[PDB]
């Protein structure tokens, strides 16, 4: 519904409800993760090599293949499994 | 704006434990390319002219 002959001073910089929108989106982003799986057992020593690719020595491979131990469903048995990751997710802990 | 990753990916379910599924990356089916975005040159130059004006 329109309003006529009415002058209000607006101020988007000292405005409220953008702080409340930020707080609501932060709390909602937190509230949509508590059902999901924590990746605590994944922090493990990764044996990584470059991906199978005809890579030049100048341009490094963005994707590194990584094989590692991983616990199975059974506590006694562990498996060896491989995956791919990016350069921006792995660091070189410290030949091999 | 158009944005794409052209690297085709295959997800792979690894069982962390009882009812714990982890989704790793499997094979790169096809070429290994670089993800990129595109914008039209003329429209971007025009909008930069507008914001300069």
């Amino acid at each position, epitope marked *: 519904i329109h309003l006529e002959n009415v002058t209000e001073e607006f101020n988007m910089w000292k405005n409220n409800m953008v702080e409340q929108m930020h707080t609501d989106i932060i709390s909602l982003w937190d509230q949509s993760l508590k059902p999901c799986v924590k990746l605590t057992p994944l922090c493990v020593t990764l044996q990584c090599t470059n991906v*199978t*690719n*005809n890579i030049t020595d100048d*341009m490094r491979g963005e994707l590194k293949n990584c094989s590692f131990n991983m616990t199975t469903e059974l506590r006694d048995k562990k498996q060896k499994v491989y995956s791919l990751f990016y350069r921006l997710d792995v660091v070189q802990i410290n030949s091999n | 704006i158009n944005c794409t990753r*052209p690297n085709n990916n295959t997800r792979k379910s690894i069982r962390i434990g009882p009812g714990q599924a982890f989704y790793a990356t499997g094979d790169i*089916i*096809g*070429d*290994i*390319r*670089q993800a*990129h975005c595109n914008v039209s040159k003329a429209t971007w130059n025009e909008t930069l002219g507008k914001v300069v004006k």
Partner: antibody, heavy 132, light 103 residues
């Protein structure tokens, strides 16, 4: 019209510096890429590599140390040089022109392409055999 | 490969595809020089006959084949593949020999 004339000793002593020459017909050595290709008897061939003016001299990283390629702009020939001929070098050798091609599969500006090569013509070869 | 003359044959060679490939098909006469038939994936030059169908190198996870329709005794040549994969390194040796003979 082109056809090549291979020339070599054919009878080589072991642990020796081999040299080969390749006469041309019509098209000069400046214009085209050149390649040498070896093939043992009853075997698949082995691409030894390609040579061109202005540094385009990529060799096979199999040998990479005991082989050299060169041209002859005055006499208009193509020369192979080899170092330390062993028993696994007895083959038939070929000089051959070759043409490049850009296989492009992605963005050109991201170097997502590669230059393949293919040898269009061949010559008579030289049945190089190493024996003391 | 041994087929009846005047037929279509399919000859496979080389490793399975990983990325995009540019293949070269060569053929060899016994005692004589080699010779080109196919230079791109499905392109043939001038001076060569037709019906040398090349497999498209845009397929991921297949083998590079060579189809020849209406074969003859002049097609008795040891065939060679030379693949150039955008993912695999540069092959300085050719594929294994696939000898086509006729009855």
């Amino acid at each position: 019209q082109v056809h090549l004339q291979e020339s070599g000793p054919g009878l080589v002593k072991p642990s020796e510096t081999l040299s080969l020459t390749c006469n041309v017909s019509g098209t000069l050595v400046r214009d085209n890429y050149w390649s040498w290709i070896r093939q043992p008897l009853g075997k698949q061939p082995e691409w030894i590599g390609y040579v061109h003016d202005s540094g385009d001299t990529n060799y096979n990283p199999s040998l990479k140390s005991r082989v050299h390629l060169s041209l002859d702009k005055s006499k208009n020939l193509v020369s192979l040089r080899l170092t330390g001929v062993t028993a696994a070098d007895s083959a038939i050798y070929y000089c051959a022109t070759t043409k490049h091609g850009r296989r492009i599969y992605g963005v050109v500006a991201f170097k997502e392409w590669f230059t393949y090569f293919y040898m269009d013509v061949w010559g008579k070869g030289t049945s190089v055999t190493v024996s003391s | 490969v041994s087929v009846a003359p005047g037929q279509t044959a399919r000859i496979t060679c080389g490793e399975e595809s990983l990325g995009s490939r540019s293949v070269i098909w060569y053929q060899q006469r016994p005692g004589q020089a080699p010779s080109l038939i196919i230079y791109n994936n499905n392109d043939r030059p001038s001076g060569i006959p037709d019906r040398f169908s090349g497999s498209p190198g845009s397929t991921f996870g297949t083998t590079a084949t060579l189809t020849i329709t209406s074969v003859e005794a002049g097609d008795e040549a040891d065939y060679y593949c030379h693949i150039w994969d955008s993912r695999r390194p540069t092959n300085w040796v050719f594929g294994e020999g696939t000898t086509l003979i006729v009855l």
